[PDB]
C-alpha cells in the first residue's frame, strides 16, 4: 500500500488547491499509476471523492483545468459529498461545482464535455443544485448548454418548484421564460404555486399567475389558496382572492382557515387578525337572508373546552373579547376544514397546550396534547 500514501497526498494537494504540487506528483508517472492516483476514492469528513470531485467542490479551478487538459480524468466519476448538513450520493464534479456556486469550474467542466444532465441518487441535476442556491448565472449557463429543465428528482420536484419555494424570483421567471411547465405536479400533486404560497413568496406567486399556472388540488386536498390560508400568508390570500376564478364557498373557507390559523401559530400569532377574518367570513355567509350559507359545524370535543363553533354572526360577536374562546375557535375551525384530509394538524394544538402549561393550566394542556396524539391515527 505504498502507492496509497501517494494517492492520499494527491487528494490532499487537489483538495487544498496546490496545483503545482499536484503537477509535480503526477508528472511522468505511468498511465496505470495516473489512473490509480486520479481514480482513488478518498474518504474524509464524511465525503467520498476523487481528486477531481474534491477540487470541483472546493472550487480549485487550476487543479480542475490541470486534471482535465493534461491527464484525461473521467468527467463522469461520482462520489459522496456533504453540503452543510445534508449528504448527496452519486454526485459528479459538475454537480458539486453547481451546488457550491463555482462558475469557473462549471464552465471548465462543461467545456470539456461533462454530462450536464447527470442525475444523483435522488435524481438531482446540476441545474437543480444551482436553482437551490439561486445562482442565476449558473442556471443560465447550464440551460444554454443543453441542460434539460424538465428533469425532476426522487419526489418529482422540479427546478421551478425548488426555485419557487426558496424565493428565487429571478430564477423562477427565467425558467418560465425557457418554456418550463408551470403545471408540473410533485409526487403528491403539489405545484410550484403550492410551494410558493406556503413560503409567502408574493412575487413568485404573481409570476406563476402571469404564466397562467393552473390552480389544482393536490393529494392533500389543498389549493394554493388553501395552503396560503393555513400558513397565515395574509398577503398571498389577499392576492389569490382577487383572482375571479374562485367560488364563494372557497373564498369563505380561505377566510375562515386564515383567521383560525392566526390564533394558534407560534410565529404568526395575531388575535386581532384572527377575529377579523373569522368575522368577515361569517358576515359573508349571512348576506342574502333568503339563501344563507349555513356551516355544518362538527360535534363538540372535550379537549377544545366542549365548545361549539359559532354558527351565526351574533354567536361570533359573543366571543369577540374572549381570548381563550377565540383560540379554541381557531383550533375547531382548523380541525373542521383540514381534519378530513391527511394533514398533520397537531402543531398548533401542541403550541396551545404549551401556552396553557406556561400559565399553569396543566389539565387543559394535557387534554389538548391527548387529542393531538389521538388525531395522528
Amino acid at each position: 500500500s505504498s502507492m496509497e500514501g501517494l494517492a492520499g497526498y494527491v487528494y490532499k494537494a487537489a483538495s487544498e488547491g496546490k496545483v503545482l504540487t499536484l503537477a509535480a506528483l503526477l508528472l511522468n508517472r505511468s498511465e496505470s499509476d495516473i489512473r490509480y492516483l486520479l481514480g482513488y476514492v478518498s474518504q474524509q469528513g464524511g465525503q467520498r471523492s476523487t481528486p477531481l470531485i474534491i477540487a470541483a467542490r472546493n472550487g480549485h479551478a487550476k487543479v480542475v483545468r490541470l486534471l482535465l487538459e493534461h491527464y484525461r480524468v473521467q468527467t463522469q466519476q461520482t462520489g459522496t459529498v456533504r453540503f452543510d448538513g445534508y449528504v448527496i450520493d452519486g454526485a459528479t464534479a459538475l454537480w458539486c461545482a453547481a451546488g457550491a456556486g463555482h462558475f469557473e469550474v462549471v464552465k471548465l467542466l462543461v467545456s470539456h464535455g461533462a454530462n450536464v444532465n447527470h442525475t444523483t441518487v435522488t435524481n438531482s441535476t446540476p441545474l437543480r443544485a444551482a436553482c437551490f442556491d439561486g445562482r442565476l448565472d449558473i442556471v443560465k449557463y447550464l440551460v444554454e448548454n443543453n441542460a434539460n429543465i424538465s428533469i425532476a428528482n426522487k419526489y418529482d420536484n422540479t427546478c421551478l418548484m425548488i426555485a419557487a419555494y426558496k424565493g428565487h424570483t429571478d430564477v423562477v421567471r427565467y425558467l418560465l421564460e425557457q418554456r418550463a411547465d408551470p403545471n408540473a405536479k410533485a409526487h403528491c400533486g403539489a405545484t410550484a404555486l403550492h410551494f410558493a404560497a406556503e413560503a409567502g413568496h408574493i412575487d413568485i406567486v404573481k409570476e406563476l399567475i402571469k404564466w397562467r399556472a393552473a390552480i389544482v388540488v393536490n393529494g392533500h386536498g389543498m389549493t394554493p389558496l388553501k395552503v396560503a390560508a393555513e400558513s397565515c400568508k395574509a398577503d398571498v390570500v389577499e392576492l389569490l382572492l382577487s383572482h375571479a376564478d374562485c367560488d364563494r364557498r372557497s373564498r369563505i373557507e380561505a377566510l375562515e382557515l386564515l383567521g383560525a390559523s392566526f390564533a394558534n401559530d407560534r410565529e404568526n400569532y395575531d388575535i386581532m387578525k384572527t377575529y377579523h377574518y373569522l368575522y368577515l367570513a361569517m358576515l359573508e355567509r349571512f348576506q342574502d337572508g333568503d339563501n344563507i350559507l349555513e356551516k355544518e359545524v362538527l360535534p363538540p370535543i372535550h379537549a377544545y373546552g366542549n365548545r361549539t363553533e359559532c354558527r351565526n354572526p351574533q354567536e361570533l360577536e359573543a366571543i369577540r373579547q374572549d381570548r381563550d374562546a377565540l383560540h379554541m375557535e381557531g383550533l375547531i375551525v382548523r380541525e373542521r376544514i383540514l381534519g378530513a384530509d391527511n394533514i398533520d394538524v397537531s402543531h398548533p394544538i401542541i403550541y396551545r397546550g404549551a401556552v396553557y402549561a406556561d400559565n399553569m393550566e396543566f389539565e387543559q394542556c394535557i387534554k389538548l396534547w391527548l387529542h393531538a396524539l389521538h388525531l395522528r391515527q
Binding site: Y86, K154, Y155, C188, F195, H220, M222, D344
Partner: peptide, 15 residues
Amino acid sequence: TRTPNCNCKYCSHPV
C-alpha cells in the same frame, strides 16, 4: 427540518 428533496410541508418524508 424538512427534507430538501420535496418542499411540500404536508408530506411525511423521513427528513
